[PDB]
Design an enzyme around this catalytic site. Structure first.
Site, mmCIF file in Angstrom:
data_model
loop_
_atom_site.group_PDB
_atom_site.id
_atom_site.type_symbol
_atom_site.label_atom_id
_atom_site.label_comp_id
_atom_site.label_asym_id
_atom_site.label_seq_id
_atom_site.Cartn_x
_atom_site.Cartn_y
_atom_site.Cartn_z
ATOM 1 N N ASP A 46 0.823 -1.200 0.000
ATOM 2 C CA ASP A 46 0.000 0.000 0.000
ATOM 3 C C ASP A 46 0.856 1.249 0.000
ATOM 4 O O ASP A 46 1.702 1.432 0.881
ATOM 5 C CB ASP A 46 -0.913 0.012 1.227
ATOM 6 C CG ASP A 46 -1.937 1.124 1.173
ATOM 7 O OD1 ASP A 46 -1.698 2.197 1.770
ATOM 8 O OD2 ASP A 46 -2.976 0.924 0.512
ATOM 9 N N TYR A 51 3.111 10.105 -0.373
ATOM 10 C CA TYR A 51 4.183 9.573 0.482
ATOM 11 C C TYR A 51 5.564 9.807 -0.116
ATOM 12 O O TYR A 51 6.571 9.721 0.589
ATOM 13 C CB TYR A 51 4.054 8.058 0.710
ATOM 14 C CG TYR A 51 2.772 7.561 1.337
ATOM 15 C CD1 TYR A 51 1.965 8.396 2.108
ATOM 16 C CD2 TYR A 51 2.365 6.239 1.151
ATOM 17 C CE1 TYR A 51 0.775 7.927 2.671
ATOM 18 C CE2 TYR A 51 1.184 5.761 1.706
ATOM 19 C CZ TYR A 51 0.390 6.608 2.461
ATOM 20 O OH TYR A 51 -0.808 6.144 2.964
ATOM 21 N N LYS A 80 -2.733 6.109 -4.403
ATOM 22 C CA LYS A 80 -3.850 6.980 -4.078
ATOM 23 C C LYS A 80 -3.627 8.384 -4.621
ATOM 24 O O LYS A 80 -2.516 8.904 -4.557
ATOM 25 C CB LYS A 80 -4.021 7.069 -2.548
ATOM 26 C CG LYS A 80 -3.790 5.757 -1.803
ATOM 27 C CD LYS A 80 -4.191 5.874 -0.336
ATOM 28 C CE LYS A 80 -3.909 4.585 0.438
ATOM 29 N NZ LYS A 80 -2.478 4.454 0.822
ATOM 30 N N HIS A 113 -7.545 9.431 -1.904
ATOM 31 C CA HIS A 113 -6.924 9.429 -0.577
ATOM 32 C C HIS A 113 -7.802 9.984 0.542
ATOM 33 O O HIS A 113 -7.858 9.405 1.623
ATOM 34 C CB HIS A 113 -5.580 10.169 -0.627
ATOM 35 C CG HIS A 113 -4.584 9.678 0.379
ATOM 36 N ND1 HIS A 113 -3.226 9.689 0.145
ATOM 37 C CD2 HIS A 113 -4.748 9.155 1.618
ATOM 38 C CE1 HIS A 113 -2.596 9.191 1.194
ATOM 39 N NE2 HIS A 113 -3.498 8.859 2.103
#
Lengths: 316, 319
Positions: A46, A51, A80, A113
């Site tokens: 994931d 990120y 996402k 997200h």
């Protein structure tokens, strides 16, 4: 695989490895961790565009593919779209950029997200002079149609959402001309916030609940006060089954039909995850765990609190 | 020593090193850090019975006294009595236990950690089967008298409080028969929470404001909240850091010193430990001090949330 069927016909491993990194860690740490997780047996990874670890995670996966450890088809990768690219025309653009960073042809799952849009731009946290987020408004149904097109173009095999409360899910589900229902709703979930009501709703609409922050997550008091993993019931049950408080928490979710995402910087801990398939909790112990629910939200995303679409105001 | 006077005649170094460690650190880490700080020039060390690092810290300190790097009198050590030992009869016992671990004859400063009592016991965060903190009722004026005795008994040179709001300080200051006013009130303070009102109040009462969390803090471990902008990201600090050829952190530290505040800072990085001493190598113009004053946004990073339901939770009032 220890998998579960999605409403669109695709399968997802019930255990996944989160790739978000502690602020202090060099983003490159994601590569090492991803390799360790793969050797430990993880197939579900994931990640998210925000990120900024996708290039490293992609390198780790391509490396384990190159040495024959795994094949792309056996890997389930999730990305996402961040708040800054919810505008319909920016959805596909962000996905393509992620694939570029990953050097992948497709992702297995693509999620919205959060149901909150922010000012478009390179900055993931655009703020005014007072440090407050510059909110933006978007039609989540339009964003959804753009997600559907990404699935039809083959850029992602499945689409779903994350951090959506039940009413927001309803907006999408009752959308005129809806083509694909989200396959999941990834939300924080653990014994202190078991998401019972939201879970029952998702299951009623054939949506899988995917949990993050399954083991929980500043100042001395705030950092040393008791937290989820300090829960005596988990510690007692861990000794009872001779596992770890973490494994009890992970198993609890699996027996509820919830897909679990976990993370750690330690190899030993990453490897222990696979034990979640080695034992079972008794009906009575499952009931005991159900009783720990205390509406403790460790990941409130406080900086968004003023956003009109902040998902955590409603009961569920 | 870059020292300032307290209302009891004693002096305290204006820069101090916090000895609280991140939950993911061996308590022994405190020994190596303290020795590093001492070599870097730190004389002021801030601890607390609850940190449970007092033994490691005392080892380091005594080590530097033994090799002659410093004398006991050149060291300013602070400890604090935890919420579970605020009962008048437990205040001194807690201190004596800390001195025992430190192997010290006295501490330079002793504080009431929070104006809230919890169920007595070895457990620091006593909770019921529901996970809720078990509060206890105590008389802080009686607790304070127990602190005064510690000072009279010579176990601590000075006494003060921490995390008290203005009215809670009043409670002590207006106490009939008061023998010693608290020398300080240690609270969270930084550009986004400058505590102007509490500071002005303390100054009017001859109370020194000691600041912790001076560079901001990120309580939430969740990615989104831990990755959103932090105090040190402030453009004003980065711009000013460039102007003075310092770091955003040094600007934030200097800001407090010029306001008459004593600053506490910590770090697991030896390089950052040394850097602190630079705060004494420059001065901020009065115009820039005004600029920094405008950064306040009442952003409390250390709310001690678990205590939010306590009758004496200090962060409810304006200040």
């Amino acid at each position: 695989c220890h998998c579960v069927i999605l409403n669109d016909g695709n399968f997802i491993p019930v255990l996944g490895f989160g790739t978000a990194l502690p602020l202090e860690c060099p983003k490159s740490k994601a590569k090492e961790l991803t390799k360790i997780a793969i050797d430990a047996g993880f197939h579900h990874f994931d990640s998210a565009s925000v990120y900024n670890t996708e290039d490293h995670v992609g390198e780790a996966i391509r490396s384990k593919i190159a040495d024959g450890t795994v094949r792309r088809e056996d890997i389930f990768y999730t990305s996402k779209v961040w708040c800054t690219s919810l505008h319909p025309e920016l959805v596909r653009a962000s996905l393509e950029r992620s694939l570029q960073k990953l050097q992948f042809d497709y992702v297995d799952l693509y999620l919205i997200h959060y149901p909150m849009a922010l000012k478009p731009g390179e900055e993931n946290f655009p703020v005014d002079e007072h440090g407050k987020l510059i909110f933006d408004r978007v039609d989540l149904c339009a964003t959804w149609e753009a997600m559907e097109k990404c699935k039809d173009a083959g850029l992602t095999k499945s689409i779903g959402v994350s951090n959506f409360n039940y009413r927001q899910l309803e907006m999408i589900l009752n959308k005129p001309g809806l083509k694909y229902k989200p396959v999941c709703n990834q939300v924080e979930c653990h014994p202190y916030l078991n998401q019972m009501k939201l879970l029952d709703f998702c299951k009623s609409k054939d949506i899988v609940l995917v949990a993050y922050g399954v083991l929980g997550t500043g100042g001395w008091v705030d950092q040393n006060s008791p937290v989820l993993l300090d829960e005596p019931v988990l510690g007692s049950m861990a000794k009872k089954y001779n596992r770890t408080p973490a494994l009890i928490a992970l198993r609890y979710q699996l027996q509820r039909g919830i897909v679990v995402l976990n993370t750690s910087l330690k190899e030993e801990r990453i490897k222990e995850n696979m034990q979640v398939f080695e034992f079972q909790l008794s009906s009575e112990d499952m009931k005991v765990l159900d009783g720990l629910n205390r509406n403790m939200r460790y990941i409130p995303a406080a900086i968004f609190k003023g956003h009109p679409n902040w998902p955590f105001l409603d009961e569920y």
